[PDB]
Amino acid sequence: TNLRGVMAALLTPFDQQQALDKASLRRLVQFNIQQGIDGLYVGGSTGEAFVQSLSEREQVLEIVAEEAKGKIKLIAHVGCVSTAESQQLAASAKRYGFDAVSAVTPFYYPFSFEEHCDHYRAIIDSADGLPMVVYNIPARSGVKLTLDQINTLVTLPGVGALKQTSGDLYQMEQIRREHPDLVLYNGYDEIFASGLLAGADGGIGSTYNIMGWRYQGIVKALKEGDIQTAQKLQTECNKVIDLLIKTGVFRGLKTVLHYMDVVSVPLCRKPFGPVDEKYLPELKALAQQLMQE
Amino acid sequence: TNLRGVMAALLTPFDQQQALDKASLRRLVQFNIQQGIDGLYVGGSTGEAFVQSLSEREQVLEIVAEEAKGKIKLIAHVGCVSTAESQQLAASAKRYGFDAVSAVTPFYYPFSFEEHCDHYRAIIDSADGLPMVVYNIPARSGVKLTLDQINTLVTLPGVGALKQTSGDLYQMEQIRREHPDLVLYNGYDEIFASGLLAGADGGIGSTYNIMGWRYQGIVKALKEGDIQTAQKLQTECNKVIDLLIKTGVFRGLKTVLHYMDVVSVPLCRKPFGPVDEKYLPELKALAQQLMQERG
Amino acid sequence: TNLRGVMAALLTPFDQQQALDKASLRRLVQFNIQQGIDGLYVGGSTGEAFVQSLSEREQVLEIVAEEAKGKIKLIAHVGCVSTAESQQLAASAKRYGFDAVSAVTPFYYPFSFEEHCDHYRAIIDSADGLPMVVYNIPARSGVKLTLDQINTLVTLPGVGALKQTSGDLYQMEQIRREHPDLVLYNGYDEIFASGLLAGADGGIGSTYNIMGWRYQGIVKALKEGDIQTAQKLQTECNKVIDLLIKTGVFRGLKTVLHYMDVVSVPLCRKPFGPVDEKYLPELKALAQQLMQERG
Amino acid sequence: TNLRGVMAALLTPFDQQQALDKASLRRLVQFNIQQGIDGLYVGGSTGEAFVQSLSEREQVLEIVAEEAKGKIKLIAHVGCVSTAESQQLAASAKRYGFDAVSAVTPFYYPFSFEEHCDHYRAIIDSADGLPMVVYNIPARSGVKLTLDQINTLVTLPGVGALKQTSGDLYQMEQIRREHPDLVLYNGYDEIFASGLLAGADGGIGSTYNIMGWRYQGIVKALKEGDIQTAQKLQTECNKVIDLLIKTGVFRGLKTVLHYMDVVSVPLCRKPFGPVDEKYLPELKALAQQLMQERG
Helix, strand or coil, rough: CCCCCCEEECCEECCCCCCCHHHHHHHHHHHHHHHHCCEEEHHHHHHHHHHHCHHHHHHHHHHHHHHHHHCCCEEEECCCCCHHHHHHHHHHHHHCCCEEEEEEEECCCCCCHHHHHHHHHHHHCCCCCCCCCEECHHHHHCCCHHHHHEEEHCCCCEEEEEEEEEHHHHHHHHHHHCCCCCCEEECCHHHHHHHHCCCEEEEEEEHHHHHHHHHHHHHHHHHHHHHHHHHHHHHHHHHHHHHHHCCCCHHHHHHHHHHHCCCCCCCCCCCCCCCCCCHHHHHHHHHHHHHCC | CCCCCCEEECCCCECCCCCCCCCHHHHHHHHHHHHHEEEEEECCCCCCCHHHHHHHHHHHHHHHHHHHCCCCEEEEECCCCHHHHHHHHHHHHHCCCCEEEECCCCCCCCHHHHHHHHHHHHHHEHHCCCCCEEEEEEEHHHCCHHHHHHHHHCCCCEEEEEECCCCHHHHHHHHHHHCCCCEEEEHHHHHHHHHHHHCCCCECCCHHHHHHHHHHHHHHHHCCCCCHHHHHHHHHHHHHHHHHHHCCCCHHHHHHHCCCCCCCCCCCCCCCCCCHHHHHHHHHHHHHHHHCCCC | CCCCEEEEEECCCEEECCCCCCHHHHHHHHHEEEEEEEEEEEECCCCHHCCHHHHHHHHHHHHHCCCCCCCCCEEEEEECHHHHHHHHHHHHHHHCCCCCEEEEEECCCCCCEEEEEEHHHHHHHCCCCCEEEEEEEEHHCCCCCCCHHHHHHHHHCCEEEECCCCCCHHHHHHHHHHHHEEEECCCCCHHHHHHHCCCCCCCEEEEEEHHHHHHHHHHHHCCCHHHHHHHHHHHHHHHHHHHHHHHCHHHHHHHHHHHHCCCCCCCCCCCCCCCHHHHHHHHCCCCCCHHCCCC | CCCCCCEECCCCCCCCCCCCCHHHHHHHHHHHHHHCEEEEECCCCCHHHCCCCCHHHHHHHHHHHHHHHCCEEEECCCCCHHHHHHHHHHHHHHHHHCCEEEEECCCCCCCCCCHHHHHHHHHHHHCCCCEEEEEEHHHHCCCCCCCCHHHHHHHHCCCEEEEECCCCCCHHHHHHHHHHCCCEEEEEEHHHHHHHHHHCCCEECCCCCHHHHHHHHHHHHHHCCCCHHHHHHHHHHHHHHHHHHHHHHHHHHHHHHHHCCCCCCCCCCCCCCCCCCHHHHHHHHHHHHHCCHHH
């Protein structure tokens, strides 16, 4: 029932025709489980949910539950701009046995804060008992929540956690101060160590798919007062992030996983383009060093 | 086909269960045709495309085509974040008989300019001959194109127009200067007259659904050098936009159309909430006012 | 006491050592008068006020008054971040015989709206009779005033105008609608024609120093309903602005004025760098073109 | 000279008439020295530099050097928008015996990166031996430097440190990784512990004026691997910052200093207004808590 921890934001493998690569998805789930990951955040931004249809997202949720249910925590990101579509995914997540649901603040169209609250309330209702993880990512959603609005969201009945994908660590601390028991996930992998120090008690990130144990290592180092190890691991994580940002994050991660024999075809769906070939050697070298870890 | 003109960005009527209200959609299409609108821009932001499934968007495109094909120009907004989804809609638009397609710059995920270009190229291919209207809306999409990038997109083979939903009239003038023959649509209704003066030769807007004749009137007034009338009309349009922004634009427009006996249920899809009851009297009064401007 | 019109935002010529070039400042004032400009806005952003000391700004105000008092309208930009500094400039503007004062919304530090109001009130007190022109330039000040805050500012006792350096023409129209008698200056030269159509009744601009007659031409053309001429003139002004933005605006303007035999040394003060020599051909040609335009 | 450490961004006390309160400036310098602060950053944003004249800024630099030279490290913020003005202050900092100079990226006018670089080179020359602390504060300056540009700046001859007033701790870490020996100051007090963890090796902040020993405590706790104590201290600091942001930061700090009998009059210069009276009891209580914390 404890949602605290390090949860990888699962990527969605696609085959040559851009259809779901089921075999690769199953391999990826098993791969994450073997890294000692606490759970999987499925169908989020990282899973390329916004370039998938509802039935495609459901298929991914169903398959992941099959592979991981009862082995690790499973959080289903069911967010869509539409409340109705989000509720359908929420209902499916409950049906498949997920531990919790999550929804990004609905975007593109401007919605009032009250409309955002009602959107979450409606999804929580359809989640039929699964706790909700509010997902705040201003840089992508364009939705800028105030601390006060955040306080209201995380106290909504049915909400059990906040995925804070914001680099504002003053706000991270304020949220922790206001909610001592809240499950608070750091969302920007590149500041994970600093985010934990500011108050997060876990994290959800796309890079956990290829080096989740490093983040688990940061949590442990900070708990043990081993600052140096925490800083060294974060630095190694950031060297990797530097590269992934240059290559394109999702495509870069899938390419590394391809060289790790997990993903058959490392492509993202259009309009994402392929990785620039000039980066393949660094991505292959990265996969090699990670495998030897 | 000449795509220049004042085209309403068609709203999509829904009922209490949030299902498409087909009868109201048909009534709204006819209402727009009766206003003397030059055409309709279907399934765009205004049509609440982003809270609809591909099948729902296709049903709307087909019904509008059935109702208006050959009577007015029809532009199908087929844009999705996904290129494949956008291509499917593009193929359907071609099948249904649309005159053109349009696609908002893909959003949420950051894409390089080259990826945007390939996205439009791919859609143009699926549009199988239907010209493409590039849709620029920085305020909503978050995609900030430079004049140079816009120049490249507008010159892509198969692109016949640009829907410029930007309040930057310096850029509007620059685009016109660089592309004298480009069909250039003013996207922000609230600066329509100034947009035409800067270089736009038409426009696409949501408020055209309820007062398209005022915008056609601005076009004509400027064509005759009657600046006073053009300003008078823009001011009235803005008095209305002031209200719609307070009430919520789409829901406010649907509510006005409901009072005009066009739309049965003025609801937008969740998460959009209903119009605050305190605004109904002003919206009803607006409906009455507008109905009188038509004689 | 009529402040409506086309006013050039005066540049401040400097000598090789970056000290004020008085002879060139006097020649530039005379050049602007000779163009038929309605007035001068002195010591504003364009005058490089923010890279000048209080005493240097006062010296410029004093010299411009000597040259032009009574011949054209004179607006003294006395805005500083500090209220006391602004008040000293305001008091000097009064002493020198200026017609009005102006102040950019205090920047760098974030101030509350009530603090901005008290700032203007204090300057107004020190202007002792000279009306205040509120200066709104969000792109530079970082101060994003709301429509309602703007309404409170332009209704402060002693405020006689608003310099609206914003490209939001919906807001321009809203301001005109709320204040029909307000002197409202369009601040972005590149959208001058569109800003007048939206409701501005004049403008203050840096490019007026080299082609003021074109903007006066736009005003006249719109007043006569000749839209083609207004657009053609705005297009010509924008071709120039395209160039100036590439070259750096103040330095490009000073360079054109150097080739018109007005400004001895066309440099701006550090950290502004000199104009890239690759642009000198176009700037030289522009100066020739402009001189030919007046016969 | 070792510039690493916790340096208070010194406030500038003003008297009842808003002139510099020299006596209080001296006592505040001594108060800071007494809490074990590593140094003082003088005449910065926090010092209300931008509402002071050059002579007033020099006067403050001179007085602070008189009180503290040789006792703690002294960094003179000499930054102005003008390069020449910055150079004059830099020469003064040198004459007064400061250990380093610093300059905020010139603001208001947009300058190219090359111009920013030349601005720093010129000040470095005038500083005559005093190392330069590049001051990056995007939220105030409006200047958005890329990591690559930051690298160029910190490697300019004469640059000895970077005052990173940015909440982006990914960039903080990238800077440390690219420059292992660089003196890197965390500029946002509210993320100090996290900033140190990301790679900063010290900090410059306004709240150090009233509770600098707490920040020194965070430095010490992290060095000893005592995470809990570091977090507890940061939390206490943030409770204070929460209040200061509500009260207005500089005025709030000055008021606490007034209650601690350090500053005679807690006024900021206009346009900053006074502290809202409803907050005085909380500020006085804070002053009492902080005084009780010193034994």
